[PDB]
Amino acid sequence: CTHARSLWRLEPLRISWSGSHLRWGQPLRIRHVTTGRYLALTEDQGLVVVDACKAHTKATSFCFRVSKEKLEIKYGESLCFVQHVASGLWLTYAAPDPKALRLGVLKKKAILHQEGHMDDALFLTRCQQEESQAARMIHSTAGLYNQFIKGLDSFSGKPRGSGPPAGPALPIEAVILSLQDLIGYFEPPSEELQHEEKQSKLRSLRNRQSLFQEEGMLSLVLNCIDRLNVYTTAAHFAEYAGEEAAESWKEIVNLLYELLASLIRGNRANCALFSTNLDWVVSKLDRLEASSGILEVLYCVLIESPEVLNIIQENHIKSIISLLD
Amino acid sequence: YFCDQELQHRVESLAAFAERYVDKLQANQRSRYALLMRAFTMSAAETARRTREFRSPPQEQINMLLHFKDEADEEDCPLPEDIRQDLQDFHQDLLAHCGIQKKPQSLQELVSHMVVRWAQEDYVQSPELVRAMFSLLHRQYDGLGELLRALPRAYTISPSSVEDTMSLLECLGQIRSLLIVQMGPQEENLMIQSIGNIMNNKVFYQHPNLMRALGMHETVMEVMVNVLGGGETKEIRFPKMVTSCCRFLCYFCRISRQNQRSMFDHLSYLLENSGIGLGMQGSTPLDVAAASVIDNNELALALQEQDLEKVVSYLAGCGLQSCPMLLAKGYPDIGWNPCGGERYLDFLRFAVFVNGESVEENANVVVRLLIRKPECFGPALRGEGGSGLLAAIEEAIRISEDPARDGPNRVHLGHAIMSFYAALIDLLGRCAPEMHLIQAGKGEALRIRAILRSLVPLDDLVGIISLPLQIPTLGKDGALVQPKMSASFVPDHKASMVLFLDRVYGIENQDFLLHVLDVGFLPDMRAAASLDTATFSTTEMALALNRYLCLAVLPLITKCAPLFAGT
Amino acid sequence: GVEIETISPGDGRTFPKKGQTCVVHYTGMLQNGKKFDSSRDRNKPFKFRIGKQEVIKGFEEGAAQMSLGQRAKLTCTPDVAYGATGHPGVIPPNATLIFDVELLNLE
Amino acid sequence: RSEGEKVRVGDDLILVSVSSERYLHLSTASGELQVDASFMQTLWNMNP
Amino acid sequence: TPLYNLPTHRACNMFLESYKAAWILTEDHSFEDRMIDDLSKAGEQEEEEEEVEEKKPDPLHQLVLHFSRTALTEKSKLDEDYLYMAYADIMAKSCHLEEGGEEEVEVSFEEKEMEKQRLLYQQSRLHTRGAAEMVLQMISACKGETGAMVSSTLKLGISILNGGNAEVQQKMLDYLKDKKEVGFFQSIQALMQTCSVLDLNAFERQNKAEGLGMVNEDGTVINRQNGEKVMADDEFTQDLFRFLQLLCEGHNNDFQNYLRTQTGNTTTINIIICTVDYLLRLQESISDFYWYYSGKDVIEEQGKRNFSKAMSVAKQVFNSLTEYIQGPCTGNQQSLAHSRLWDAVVGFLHVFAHMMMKLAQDSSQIELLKELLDLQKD
Amino acid sequence: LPGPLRAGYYDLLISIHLESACRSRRSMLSEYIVPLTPETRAITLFPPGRKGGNARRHGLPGVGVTTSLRPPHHFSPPCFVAALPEAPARLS
C-alpha cells in the first residue's frame, strides 16, 4: 500500500471533464503513475498495462459502474465495480491459485470476467501530494536514467575512432540537472530546526528514501555507476564516447555517488541492502574519481547498518587501511 | 554516585537491624514457646498460640510478630514492649535518614537546591543533562521509594558461604560483561565455563531467593535472545551455547517452584522461538518450556490457549512437511518429521498431565485444537487416506527392517514414526477425562471421551498390544544379538498404548479382558519369563520390557483383578 | 640467537641460576627504532626467575648470560622470541627485538 | 465476518456440531456428493 | 515450622520482607504537592527576564518539554521509562489532591466553589506548561499498546481533565487539530480493541487453582494470591473511558464532533462506535456469566467480585456514552441510534431482569442488587 | 595540552585501564547483598556521636564502612617480554 506501485492516475477520455467530478459509467483511462503504462486489454491475458502507443480507446477505456446491474463517485466510503466500456468484462479477482497459496502473499491476478464476483467493488483512496510528486519524479528519473544507460551501452565496447560513438547522444545535461535536483530533494533536514519540525521532516525524508529504494532507483543509480566506472579515466571515456561527453564525466560520477549517499542516508533497510555490495563499495574505495563520495557512502552504510559490520572481512579492513596509506 | 552510596548505607543498616532484631525476637519466641509448654492450665490461650504462632509458616508467624506497627493491633503480637519500642525507634531513625521527618545541611537538601538552582538559572539544552538532573531530584525527593525498590534486590547471606558468593558474583560479572560482546567462539567457550561454574557452585541451589534477586536467569535469557537472533536466520548458531543455556535455565526451573514461576512468566517467547531446525537435538527452548510447565498445577492452569494454539501449529507443520535436516542427511523423504512431532507431543503431554492427574481445561483445549487441525495426527489417522494406526506401525516395522529405506545419535525413521504415534496416543490418553468425571456423567467429559473413542479404534490398539517383538538371543558363535536401541520397536510404545487403553476403554468385561490377555499380555509374560535368566537379563531392551511390565500392564492387572473372578 | 652487547659493565661476578629471581628494568625496542615495552617508564622492576620459561627464551638466556648491574643490549631473534606476532599489535611479524637489560638485584 | 455478529442472508456459514465437534461437510471423494460431519470445513451458505 | 530453629540469614531475609510489606509500604509520605510547587516556582529568572517577553521556562516547564521531546522522538515503540512513570504519578497526584477533597456535613456553595478553584489552579500549574500536549503525544506514541506507560499517561490526563474544564479541553482540541495526526485516535481504537471482558474459562481456571492451593519455598503460602485473570486491566479500561468522558464533559460539542469524525485528518475513527463495540462485548460476556450462574442457587464470593468489577466497568462505559450524547449533539445521537446500541441494550435488559429476580430471591446479595440497580439507572 | 588531545588522552587512560573494571563494578552495584559479620553488626543507621548535635546528624555520604559483597577488581601487568601462551581471557 505504501509502495508507489499502488498509485493509479485516472485520466478521463474527455479532457473537458478532467477536473470535473467523476461520473459513474464515464469512459476513462487508468494509468500506472510509476511506470507510465496504461491499463488495457490484450488477446493473451485478460488485462495488462500497455504503452501509451498501444493505449487506444478500444483497450484502455474503463468505467466505474455502480453495480453489476445493466444501465458522483465518492472518494472513499463507497464502492465501485470496474468494467471495460466496450467489452463489458468486469474487473474481478482470480480464483486462489494453489501456487500463490503456497506463497506467503496471496497476490491475486486481476482478470476481466463478465461473470463478476461480489468483492469486485473498490475503495478508492487518494494518496498524498508528496507521494504523488515522488512517483512522478520516479517515473521521469527512471526514463532519463534508462536513456543514459542505453547510450552508455551503445558506445560501450566500440571505440570512438574519430567518429560519432552513437546516433542518439547522451542526455548529459538532463542527467546532471536530475542528479542535482534529487540531491536537493533528499537533502537532510537542518539541525537548526526545532525538535518536532526536525523529526517530522526526518520522517518525510525517511519515507521518501524508502519509496525510492523499494521502487529500485537505488539499484538503477548503482547500475549507472557501474556503467560509468567501467572506464578508468576521463581520457578513456573520451576514447570511447565523445570528448564533449567526457567533459563532465567526473561531475556525473561525483553526483551519482552523492545521490547514492543521500538515498542510503539514515535508512536501516537501505544500508542493509548493501550487505551484498560491501565488496562493491570497498573495491571502488580506491578510485580517484569521487573518492570522498565513495568514502561517505561507506561511512553511511557502516554507521546505519550492523549487518555489514558483521560481514566485514580482513580484505575489506586492509582496503580501508590502504585508503590511509 | 554519592546517593547510591547513601542508599547502600541505608540497606546495610537495615540488614544490621535485621540481624539484631531476629536475634532478639528468636530468643523471645523461644522463651514464649517454653512458657506455653509449661502453662498447661490456659487451654484456650495455649491452643490459639499453638495454632497461630507455632503451627504457621515462618513468614506468616514473622508477619504476625511484626504486625504491631498499626496502633489497633497492639495486642495480637506477643512481643515485649521493649522490643516493640526498639523496632519503632529504628523506624523513626530510618525515616529521619530518608528525610521524612537556608543553607543545605545534608546531601538531599544540597541536591534539591542544586537542581532547582540550575533549572531556574537557565533553560538547559542537553537532554541527558535534563534526564540526569531530574532523576537526581526524584531520588532525593523519594528516599523511601528508592529503598522500597532496592529492598527486593537486598539479600542477607550467611558468613560461611561468602567465598562461593563472591565466586558466583565474579561469574555473573563475566556473563554480564560478555553480554555486550558479539557472540563468537571464545565468548561461547567462556560462557560455557561460567555457566558450568555457576551450576557447580553450591549457592545456586542453596538460595533460590538470592538466585532470583541477582536475577541472571533474565541474563541467560538475554543470551538466548542474542544467539537466537542469528540462529533463526539460516541454521542455528552455537548449538553448544543453546544446550548450556537450557542446562542452566532448565536446572534452575528444577531447583524451585518460584524459579519455575519466574521462568513460566516468559513462556510465550520460548514457544515462539522453538523450532525443529533450531532444536533439532539437545537442550532447547521447548525443553525449558517443558521444565517450566511440568510437575506444576497452578502453572498448568495458567497455561495460555494462545500458547497451546502455537504448539498445535508447530505440530501441524511437523505433520505437513518432512525434516529438512533429515533430507540433508539423505534419509528417505517421509513427508513429515516424526522427531519434531514427538517433541511437541511430549511438550503437550507435560502440559496436559501434571501431578499424576489429567487437567480438564488444558485437556479439552488441546483435543479441541487437535481435531480442528487434523494434519497434526499424522498420515496414519488422516481421514482421506485411512492408512490405519496398526498398518502404519507394521509399515514402520518393515521400514526399520529393510536397511535401504532405513539408511541415508543416528536417526532411525521407522522408530521415529513409531515414537510419534506412541506420543500422540499417549497425549490423547492423558487428555482423556478422569474416571470421576466419567462416573459423574458430565457432558463435556463424555463428549471428549467419545471424540477420543472415534479418533482411535479398538482393533488397532489391541493389534499393537499383540504386536510381536524381537528378542535378544545368543548367537550360534556366542555373540548376543540384541535389537538395536532406538532403531527397533521399543516397549514404551506398548506402554503408551495400554495407558490410552485403560484411560479411555477402562476394562469392564472379562471377554475383552481375556482377549487382550491372550493377545498381548500373556505373550509379554512369556517373553519376560524367558528373558529372566542372567544370560539375557542384563540387556537394556529386556530391562525396558521389565519397566514396561511393572509401570504399565501390571497395574492394569491389579485394577482388573476383581474382574478376573469366575474364570 | 640472542646477541649480547655490553653497554655498561657491571659486577662480572654474580650470574643468575636456574631458579634465581631477577628484577630487570628493560627497554624493549624494535630493529627500526620503535620501542614496544618500556618497563622503566612504567616503573616495573619486572621479576622473573631464570629457567622456568615464563619469559621468551632469548631474553631469559640473555639475562642469565649477563651479570648483576651490567647494562647490556640483547638482540633476540624472532625465532627465539615472538615468532609470529607475539602480543599482536605490540610486535610486528618476524622482527628482531632489542632489549636494554640491567639486573637491579639478583634474588 | 466475525463472531457475535448477526448472520446476513446468503452469507456463507460453517455449521459445527456441538456433540461431535465436527463440521458439516460435502464429501465428493467417493464419486457421489454426500453429507457427513467430519473434521474439515465446508461453507454451507444456508439461505431462508 | 518453628522460627528459632531457622537459620539466622533466612530469618533476616523474612524480616526484611515483612518490614518492607508492613512498615515501609504502609508508611505514607506526601512530597508530590511540595515538590511540584518547588518545581513550578520560577525563582529569579523572571526577575532578571522582565525585559524579555520570551522568558526561559521554569523547571516544571523544562521537565514537560523534555517529556514532550521524548514523546516526539520517532521511535518504533514507546519504551518504558521509570522516570516518566514517577514524574507522571507525582504531577497527577499533585493536581488530584484538590479533586479528592484535599450524617456527613454538607458543603456550602462557597466551599464547593473554593474547592473547584483550587482544583483549577492545581491543573493550571501543569496545563499552562504543556501537560495536555504531553499526554496527547504519549497516547499517540504508545501505538495502541496496553501497558503501565499508557496507564500512567491516562492517569495524568484524567487528573488534568478532572471537572471537564474548558481550558485543557480547548488546548487538547487545538493541539489535535493543529497537528492533524491520526496516531492519537488510532491508539485509542487499538486500546479499545485490546481491552478485556469477562472470561468464564478464566473464572473456572481461577476457581480450580484456588481450590487446589500450593506451597512456597521460603515459608509456605497456601492458596497463593495470583493475578486476577478475570477482569484484568479493569482499572485501565475504567481510566480509558473516564478519560474519554472527561474529554467530552461539559457538553463541548467541538470535541464531541471531533471524536465522532476527525475532520482534516486523512482517516477518521469513530470512538463512539468503538465504545459501542466494547459495550457489546461486555454485554455478551455478562450475559454468558448469567447463563453460567443461573443454574447455581447462590453466587459465590468470587462471582460476586467479578460481577462488581465488570458492572463498575459497565457503569463507566454508560457514563462515557451519556457524556457523548449529553447536549443537542444530533450527530452523536444519530450514530448511537443507528449503531447496534439497541441490541446491546436488549442484552443488558435481559441480564438486568434475570439478575434482579435472582438477587431479590437471595437475601445476602443486597450489595450486588444495589449495584445492579445503579447500573440500570445509568 | 590542547583540549581535544587532553580529552582523548584522559578517556584513553580510562578506556585501557579502568573501563572493564568500572563496568563490572557498575553492573554489580545494582544488587545489595550483605553477610553476617562483626562489621555488619557494627553498621549503624546514624553515626554514634552520642551528642545533641550528632542527634539526627547525617554522616558524610560514601565515607562509611561498606560490607556489601563486591567482587574484587582484577588487573594484570602489561608486560610484553614474558612469553605469551584454551588461553583464558586477559585482564585489564
Short mmCIF file of N, CA and C in Angstrom, two decimals, chain C residues 26 36-37 42 44 46 54 56 82 87 99, chain F residues 76-85 90:
data_model
loop_
_atom_site.label_atom_id
_atom_site.label_comp_id
_atom_site.label_asym_id
_atom_site.label_seq_id
_atom_site.Cartn_x
_atom_site.Cartn_y
_atom_site.Cartn_z
N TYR C 26 64.05 -3.09 31.80
CA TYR C 26 64.43 -3.19 30.40
C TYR C 26 63.75 -2.12 29.57
N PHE C 36 58.60 -0.93 22.22
CA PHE C 36 57.31 -1.56 22.46
C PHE C 36 57.05 -1.92 23.91
N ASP C 37 58.05 -1.85 24.80
CA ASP C 37 57.84 -2.25 26.19
C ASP C 37 58.84 -1.49 27.06
N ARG C 42 57.25 2.62 32.93
CA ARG C 42 56.14 2.08 33.71
C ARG C 42 56.51 1.77 35.15
N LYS C 44 58.43 -0.58 36.50
CA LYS C 44 58.24 -2.01 36.74
C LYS C 44 59.60 -2.71 36.78
N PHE C 46 60.64 -5.77 36.61
CA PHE C 46 59.90 -6.98 36.27
C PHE C 46 60.65 -8.16 36.89
N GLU C 54 58.89 -18.79 31.62
CA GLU C 54 57.83 -17.79 31.63
C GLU C 54 58.17 -16.61 30.73
N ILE C 56 60.32 -15.14 27.22
CA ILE C 56 60.89 -15.55 25.94
C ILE C 56 62.33 -16.00 26.14
N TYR C 82 58.93 -14.41 19.99
CA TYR C 82 57.77 -13.90 19.25
C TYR C 82 57.89 -14.20 17.75
N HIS C 87 51.99 -11.02 21.13
CA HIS C 87 51.18 -9.88 21.55
C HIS C 87 50.81 -9.04 20.33
N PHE C 99 66.67 -5.39 23.55
CA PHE C 99 66.31 -5.15 24.94
C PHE C 99 67.50 -4.57 25.69
N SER F 76 46.01 -7.21 35.44
CA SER F 76 47.19 -7.93 35.04
C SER F 76 48.27 -6.96 34.58
N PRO F 77 49.54 -7.22 34.91
CA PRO F 77 50.62 -6.33 34.48
C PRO F 77 50.78 -6.37 32.97
N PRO F 78 50.91 -5.21 32.33
CA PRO F 78 51.08 -5.17 30.86
C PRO F 78 52.54 -5.37 30.45
N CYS F 79 52.99 -6.62 30.54
CA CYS F 79 54.36 -6.99 30.18
C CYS F 79 54.34 -7.72 28.85
N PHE F 80 55.18 -7.27 27.92
CA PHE F 80 55.26 -7.85 26.58
C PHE F 80 56.65 -8.40 26.30
N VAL F 81 57.34 -8.86 27.34
CA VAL F 81 58.56 -9.63 27.19
C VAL F 81 58.44 -11.04 27.76
N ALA F 82 57.47 -11.30 28.63
CA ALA F 82 57.19 -12.68 29.02
C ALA F 82 56.54 -13.41 27.85
N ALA F 83 56.89 -14.68 27.69
CA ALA F 83 56.35 -15.48 26.60
C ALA F 83 54.84 -15.60 26.72
N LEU F 84 54.14 -15.29 25.63
CA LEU F 84 52.68 -15.26 25.65
C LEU F 84 52.14 -16.64 25.30
N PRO F 85 51.35 -17.28 26.19
CA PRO F 85 50.73 -18.58 25.95
C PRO F 85 49.81 -18.58 24.72
N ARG F 90 42.25 -12.34 29.04
CA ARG F 90 43.18 -11.49 29.75
C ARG F 90 42.43 -10.51 30.66
#
